[PDB]
Design a protein around this ligand. Structure first.
Ligand code: NA
Ligand code: NA
Lengths: 247, 239
């Protein structure tokens, strides 16, 4: 059975003090990290503080990684740098980077390649827009985005996929858990076709639409949904109840 | 004008290399009341670098978000930098304009955000080879006027001229003079004379004295030469 995977994406939020409070509440949840992965993704400049405060049962990672290695790339964090810090996970392809920062599929492929070359584990995100879904292009769009990188995966525990239903983010639409399950099953079929059946059965595919303490169980109880990359709910002490849905 | 010498480490460093390097930099006895010396490590190295450098060194980050806190995956807000006591940000560096499509509107937003949050800003601009062959003053003016009306305290914003077209010290000096005229015309005589205007082209131990001696160059935003222990001689040239 796939190991469930529950991730907190803090995005651009936090102070030193709010992290101290939050991490203290997180550390009070007794869970076994051999039975589920729980990963926290603070802002880059908060990584050291966050890593120090969380107990070792929590994994940690950063929200983006450079497509370039070391050198004259002002502002970027190379995968080589993250490896030297033992940063375990990186998020790649998050829709906010594609939206505000013009990140492309080619960018996602190059960042994944840098990450795996440096022994980082990658959480790689994709998903279609409302206009794409209304034109019945969900499968075409998702296949193209997944095929941009999936053939690079060399270890199916170390890359984690995230379906972001952009048509249901800020649009007034709500994805049901059944709608999400169908998209997850299709993502898994893409992986089987490029990488193999054992590989597709092993890879975690997370839901990355809106997740909170109310809907989390209806989502993770779906057969092909293996956890979540969680947004603002993960800034609340109640995020522990989301982690409990995977325990 | 207090001189200003800055180490831009760009995307370089390991925990061990930064230990060695900061240990050499800490051996230079300079007076931070006389001279500003700023180190700008990679974001994930900020904490380690700040803990290692003596407080005479100021520190900063190489970029800041144009957005506030909230749902902007991968970004670092000015509000976050303020809370961490990050003292400086670099804004508008040519590598961001080049690889990351950063625009003049982005520079102004980022400055406004940084100043709202009491950060000091090292703002970078400069013309390309094509613009030089044809537009130097038109282009640099468009660039400074993107953000200059936002400067409220002329000690806290540092301008940096990057000769993307490349430069002699004499050619650098001319642009610096032009830049200071832009500030004088926009913000006033006394404001123009207070603002530091640094050289952002290639600086090393062999050219640093020729550059700093120029009337309108007030220090440097230094690249690869700042990853070496000899950066201390660069700092010395400004002492
Ligand atoms: Na499931
Ligand atoms: Na001078």
């Amino acid at each position: 059975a796939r190991k469930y995977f529950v991730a907190a994406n803090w995005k651009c939020n936090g102070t030193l003090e709010s992290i101290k409070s939050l991490t203290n509440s997180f550390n009070n949840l007794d869970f076994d990290p051999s039975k589920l992965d729980v990963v926290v993704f603070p802002v880059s400049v908060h990584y050291d503080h966050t890593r120090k405060l969380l107990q070792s049962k929590f994994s940690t990672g950063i929200q983006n990684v450079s497509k370039f290695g070391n050198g004259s790339y002002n502002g970027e964090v190379s995968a080589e740098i993250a490896k030297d810090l033992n940063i375990e996970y990186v998020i790649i392809g998050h829709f906010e980077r594609r939206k505000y920062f013009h990140e492309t599929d080619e960018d996602v492929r190059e960042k994944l390649q840098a990450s795996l070359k440096n022994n980082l584990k990658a959480v790689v995100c994709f998903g279609e827009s409302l206009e794409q879904r209304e034109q019945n292009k969900t499968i075409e769009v998702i296949t193209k985005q997944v095929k941009a990188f999936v053939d690079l995966i060399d270890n199916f525990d170390n890359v984690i996929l995230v379906y972001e239903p952009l048509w249901a983010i800020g649009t007034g639409k709500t994805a049901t858990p059944e709608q999400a399950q169908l998209v997850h099953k299709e993502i898994r079929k893409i992986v089987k076709d490029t990488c193999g059946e054992k590989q597709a059965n092993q890879i975690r595919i997370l839901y990355g639409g809106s997740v909170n303490t109310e809907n989390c169980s209806s989502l993770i109880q779906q057969e092909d949904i293996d956890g979540f990359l969680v947004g603002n709910a993960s800034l609340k002490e109640s995020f522990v109840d989301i982690i409990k849905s995977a325990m």
